Write a protein that binds this ligand. Sequence first.
Ligand SMILES: *[C@@H]1O[C@H](CO)[C@@H](O)[C@H](O)[C@H]1NC(C)=O
Ligand SMILES: *[C@@H]1O[C@H](CO)[C@@H](O)[C@H](O)[C@H]1NC(C)=O
Ligand SMILES: *[C@@H]1O[C@H](CO)[C@@H](O)[C@H](O)[C@H]1NC(C)=O
Ligand SMILES: *[C@@H]1O[C@H](CO)[C@@H](O)[C@H](O)[C@H]1NC(C)=O
Ligand SMILES: *[C@@H]1O[C@H](CO)[C@@H](O)[C@H](O)[C@H]1NC(C)=O
Ligand SMILES: *[C@@H]1O[C@H](CO)[C@@H](O)[C@H](O)[C@H]1NC(C)=O
Lengths: 72, 72, 72, 494, 494, 494
Amino acid sequence: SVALVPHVGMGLETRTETWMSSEGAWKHVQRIETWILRHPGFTMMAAILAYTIGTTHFQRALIFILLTAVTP
Amino acid sequence: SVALVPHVGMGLETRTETWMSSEGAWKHVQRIETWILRHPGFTMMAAILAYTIGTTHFQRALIFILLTAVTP
Amino acid sequence: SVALVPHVGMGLETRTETWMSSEGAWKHVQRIETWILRHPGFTMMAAILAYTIGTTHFQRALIFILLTAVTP
Amino acid sequence: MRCIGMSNRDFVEGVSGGSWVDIVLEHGSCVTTMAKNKPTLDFELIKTEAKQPATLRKYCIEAKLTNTTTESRCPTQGEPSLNEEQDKRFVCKHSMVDRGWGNGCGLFGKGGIVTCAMFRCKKNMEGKVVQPENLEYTIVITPHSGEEHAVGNDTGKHGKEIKITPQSSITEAELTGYGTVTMECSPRTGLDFNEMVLLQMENKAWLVHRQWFLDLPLPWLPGADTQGSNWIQKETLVTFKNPHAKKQDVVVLGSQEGAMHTALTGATEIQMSSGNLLFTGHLKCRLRMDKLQLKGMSYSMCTGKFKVVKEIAETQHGTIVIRVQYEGDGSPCKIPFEIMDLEKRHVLGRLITVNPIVTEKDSPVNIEAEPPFGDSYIIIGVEPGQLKLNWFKKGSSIGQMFETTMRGAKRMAILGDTAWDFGSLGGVFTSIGKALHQVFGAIYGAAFSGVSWTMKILIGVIITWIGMNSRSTSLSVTLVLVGIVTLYLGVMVQ
Amino acid sequence: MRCIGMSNRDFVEGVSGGSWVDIVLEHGSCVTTMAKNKPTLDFELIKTEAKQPATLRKYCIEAKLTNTTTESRCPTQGEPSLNEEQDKRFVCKHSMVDRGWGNGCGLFGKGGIVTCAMFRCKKNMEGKVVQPENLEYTIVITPHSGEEHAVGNDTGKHGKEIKITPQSSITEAELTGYGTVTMECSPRTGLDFNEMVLLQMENKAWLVHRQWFLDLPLPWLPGADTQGSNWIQKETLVTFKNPHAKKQDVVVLGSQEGAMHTALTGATEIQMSSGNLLFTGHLKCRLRMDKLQLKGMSYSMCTGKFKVVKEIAETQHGTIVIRVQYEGDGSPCKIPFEIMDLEKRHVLGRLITVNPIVTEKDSPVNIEAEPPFGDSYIIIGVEPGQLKLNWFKKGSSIGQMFETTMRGAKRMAILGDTAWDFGSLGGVFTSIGKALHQVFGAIYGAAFSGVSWTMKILIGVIITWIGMNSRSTSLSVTLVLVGIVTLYLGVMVQ
Amino acid sequence: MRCIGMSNRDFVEGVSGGSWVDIVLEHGSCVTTMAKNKPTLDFELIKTEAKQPATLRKYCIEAKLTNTTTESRCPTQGEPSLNEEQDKRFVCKHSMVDRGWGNGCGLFGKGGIVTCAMFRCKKNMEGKVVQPENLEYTIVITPHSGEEHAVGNDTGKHGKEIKITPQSSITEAELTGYGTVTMECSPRTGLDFNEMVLLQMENKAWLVHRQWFLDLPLPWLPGADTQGSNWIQKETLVTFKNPHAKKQDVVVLGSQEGAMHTALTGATEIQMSSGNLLFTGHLKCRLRMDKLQLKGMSYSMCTGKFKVVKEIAETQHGTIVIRVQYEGDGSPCKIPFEIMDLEKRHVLGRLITVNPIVTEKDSPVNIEAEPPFGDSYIIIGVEPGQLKLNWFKKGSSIGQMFETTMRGAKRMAILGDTAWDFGSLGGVFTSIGKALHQVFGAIYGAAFSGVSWTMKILIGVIITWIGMNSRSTSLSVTLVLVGIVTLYLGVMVQ
Ligand SMILES: *[C@@H]1O[C@H](CO)[C@@H](O)[C@H](O)[C@H]1NC(C)=O
Ligand SMILES: *[C@@H]1O[C@H](CO)[C@@H](O)[C@H](O)[C@H]1NC(C)=O
Ligand SMILES: *[C@@H]1O[C@H](CO)[C@@H](O)[C@H](O)[C@H]1NC(C)=O
Ligand SMILES: *[C@@H]1O[C@H](CO)[C@@H](O)[C@H](O)[C@H]1NC(C)=O
Ligand SMILES: *[C@@H]1O[C@H](CO)[C@@H](O)[C@H](O)[C@H]1NC(C)=O
Ligand SMILES: *[C@@H]1O[C@H](CO)[C@@H](O)[C@H](O)[C@H]1NC(C)=O
């Protein structure tokens, strides 16, 4: 749907506040947090998968947060 | 027949578009794609036949695409 | 177009000859031979290209005839 | 007798387990079935009637474009719209033209332009799918009765007509004086119409493949359509040109009837004028001759004389037909027909026409028989009045072996796994042979699915070369024989 | 005066090369310019009047399905057709359902089924585009004169309202007694509308990107459509549910007002009721005050005293405003306003309201001045009657420098390469800086096309880690700088 | 001004040695020539009249068979002869059928059969050829004068129509007040019609190759034939089917109009209703402006005011067009048009419309000029009354460089060695370059004779792989260059 694709990043931002600039800016972080809280099993599975696939102590956390972010 | 051997590449191409310029350009590509998706067995057979005849990792794919494109 | 895709190989061939059984059998062969006679430069170019790309004394002629028949 | 004029003629000499024998009757061919103590018959599949055809898809071969409308739009102002775009009858296309102050616009750039034209189909070809259950195979059964004109008579009135229908797999054919025969045909198995369409176009009909008929790049409408105004994929018969990027002109292509004809190089031509008449394919049936009796078996040997009405004529397979007229009394009798060598040690040749009899007086009867290779003597009469006809039949044993091997190979190439059941009397050997051939034919159809005969030859040569280059055992000779089979299938096609 | 009540306010103290200065006026902010011997001015872009809007595309947000019809087809007999399929107003879809003897057909399998429903959009949204030549930027210019309620008066009637239009870029503004000023702005370059779309929906308007607007998954029709019946991509609002493959039920989705509102997070809201009123964006241009003269320079220093009307109030940027009323004789005069320290060795602070005068006797005059950090004394009157007003301005020089650096960084993040023209007085240094920042911003936009602020922070942290891990010289510090500026653009967004 | 509306527009900016310049005028494109002291001109090859067409060969697309006769011969008796065998109108074909006693014969075997049918062509197409001296290239020359209706006016009535004829190569064009210009073409060099054929079919004409037209597998007759009854190669439109080897029936194929339209995927459509109107091709030839003079160069600079009639609009190449009307007195004057930077120090943008003048009062004047990238101030009036309009042109210097490089590459790929003469001012460098390009194009046409664009891409990537695999010096880089030019030629097709 249209709601899936947001208007952020288009470069048309100015000094004036945008539409739904207060709650729409942090809504992704909040939805990811509540999704992780509702699904802790998938979170731990992605964590151990990133831990066993990274093996660099930096790519582990990167792949972990990517797997928890790309999953709505 | 008459429909075969089109008037392509004859060197008379100019700045203006030719007869059947939109559909005639990708006509062969589209018909080959249709013939491949309709008969994938021959595609895999030609791939297996070319993998054992190329022996250079480049002639294999070349002979494969040539076999899948030569068949009308 | 529709004439580009024939009805050959469909497995419905019976004892009775099919439509265009006399001229349709050697139609592609004779059209390729006439296209060769009308365009010998491309034939010799494909021949030398396949000779330089084969380096095995067998796949040269195969690639040559494939490149000659694949071009309508 | 009717099978004699046929060139591609087959001879079955097998009955076992209840005189049942599996034969495959072809439209262009005919099968001569003979036994030891049972009369010989000639089965020819002369027609296939397909009733209640269901329209699958109608394509347009020649059309026209009326109400040519065009409207441009200024650049950076969206696309142009038309009231004819909402009607799918109007084929429409959008493109970009050069818009500036000379075209009534304010900006200079690529402006959208829509071109619509009412697509009216001038002539259309129809696609009909027929269920394998509504078929009707017309089979003529000519018994070797030795009539004056039964030899090669394709007009009929000499044999019996059987309408093999899937509704009644079991059927009986009652002959004149030979009794009744059983013919259990399997029309659903051989030449299945579930993937075949009866494409009709300008009084010319073809038996096309369904998968090949569905993906034809032509404007089509479903068979359920009764209006005929809506067409799917109208862009295949309609082109849009943008000369100099100034205006868009829409043009209707010519009649695709010639393109269709040159696109049907593998489809078989049939007759669809008042009824769907398929004249191609095959029909495999088991034949049972338990109730079939020899006409005139109770007749004794007539001690009269015979006269040669028609000279001995050798057919393409080597069987000779001789027309002899009985002169003596007692017309119902058994003709003492035999074929011996020059020294006349014993009967060396065989008789195609089993138990030749004389029906009525002064009626020339025909007798077909396969003489041996070389010189032979045909004996027609009894010792007092005897016709010792000398006949030299060309050929050899190895020659006939090669001919019958090539005929069997061609039959296997044409019928696939159905030719292995031709003349099969049962058993584990023929069963496993047919099973292996069916598996190999399925693999071949998966590999060689829609390739041409030239491509078949090329792939066979490549496979043979790879097999000859294969140094490992148990894998080279298999590839060589596969390549030879592919070469044979390529040289034996259409 | 009008610029004092503004939270986001800028101060320009540069004029050279012909008394010109480049300033960037924004809608939410305002610019307070001043010179050495020229009167200070306050420029505020209050409104942008976009005229002659051309609708390029109208998306549907809520529709209704009428005349819902459907029909199924027997398996292996093609697709089912409907008379409504030829009408693009009817959205349709083909699928397969279980067909057998219980449904009315004879074959058992997957039969084709189609269902058509008339797509009648009840409410929709409109997307328009305006040419950059049709803009009208309304800019208010309020000179510091010192009326009774001039400070923070956003109603108007205090300055001049100039309508910058690209039809006449060069234009003069005639003030009351301050002479004339020159300001050509060319709204084409600032906030170009060639890639932006004004989107209107339920009396709520947004300034969306053109590419983001064209790729909206909603039923749309071109802006040139006047009937509104034919829609494109109607399958986004109309779905077809086939439970258990029995029947295909068509149904329209809910209203997309909320989905669009949550889809317009990065879009800036504007007002479109009777005219296109843009209240966002920026406008960078050159201002020439060579013809600008000081109002009241011919007046001498009056000897009368002053009385404080309103107490000294410090603004958000450090400037103070004092409202004083003249009591002596000879009201038209130059107020001896200054800011000194305790010992009064010389003036330490600067005066914002250049040349403060009293226009009328018994009229409160507002004086704005920027005192130094720490303690300061504001002298207003002559030595007989003098106002000794103490003021303690909190902060330090390092704090002011950090605040100015943060403001400049925010301006460069909001305007991009346009902020480098803010307060520019020419020269090769600022020119090469603007060029380098323009190339860097082009590369940034090519890399960060439409990423979110969270993904922006993520890529910034990634680049910072790569730079800290890269051990090469002249290549890691650049990566750390890119990571820092990406983190800053992430935390300073929306 | 007519060249402004064209998207594919070229700009020639060179004259030397008598002000001669070689330009290639195309039908889809237009040429804009300009000098430093001579007025700019716009050349558009709008039409090519081909007179005196001689029919070379008429092909048949739809025929009809009548008087279908057949005759079967007994085996071992030769081929059956009919009275229609000598008649060249009747198409015949010999075959073998099964002959025996059932067919009226005495022997059994393969008997010869002949089937003749009168070949009556109902619909056919005609190929014509025209001598290269019978061409008449219509070239419109619209000088930049400033008429409000001259910008992109394809209707004409504003320029001069020149009929370039190979009999009269050197021709003169007399403009209104700009003087005379010389054009020498002799079209015998380009567009060799000795190897091209105008193929007309159902009021649709194409420009095809002679070798491809003479190799069409269709029933044809020479152009000298009048009766039209004799057709050569009739078997390409008729099929002789021998079902079951019983009888040989001949059936005429459908209309080959659709198959022909398919066979013309690279042919260019033209107009042939009453005269052969070629709207494709090119004409490279020389233009001499030595006799050409600037109109109104002796006029002074008028001091009056100007008003903007039409706003500034940028073309696809970047040249802006401004329509402004003069207000003051003294109508015959010279418009002080200039394009300066933000600082207004020196002119940067060049004027496409050189020497803009005001012809009559109350008449809008069009002025085209190429502004620099970024912001540019267009000054139209004198210091007191001046239209200082700022315009922002997007792009960069490297952007325009890549754009013009791609334009030149496309022109080369389209014109062969002819594009090297575009804007050629003479010298040894361009001469040897054109010679090398002609040799390379000859070798290319020898190698890439009639291959499609897909085959072009395939051969290009193959040559690129071979060049990357080659390790020898001076052989890898040339092979990579051949591969990449083949890739570009395959990409830019149709
Ligand atoms: C199309 O043209 C015909 C003939 O000019 C006319 O009768 C008809 O009204 C037009 N419109 C439609 C929709 O057929
Ligand atoms: C072309 O010139 C003619 C001259 O009469 C004018 O009527 C017409 O409007 C012009 N076309 C344009 C400006 O597109
Ligand atoms: C839909 O139905 C209504 C009433 O049931 C009718 O008025 C309308 O014409 C119909 N729409 C069609 C047939 O397109
Ligand atoms: C603002 O200016 C208006 C017009 O001069 C005046 O009526 C008003 O009192 C001033 N102050 C406020 C707070 O509106
Ligand atoms: C063809 O048949 C028609 C039928 O009447 C006849 O008039 C004509 O003479 C015949 N032509 C030939 C060449 O036999
Ligand atoms: C076929 O039989 C019919 C029976 O009436 C006869 O008239 C006809 O002559 C026979 N055909 C041949 C070729 O003998």
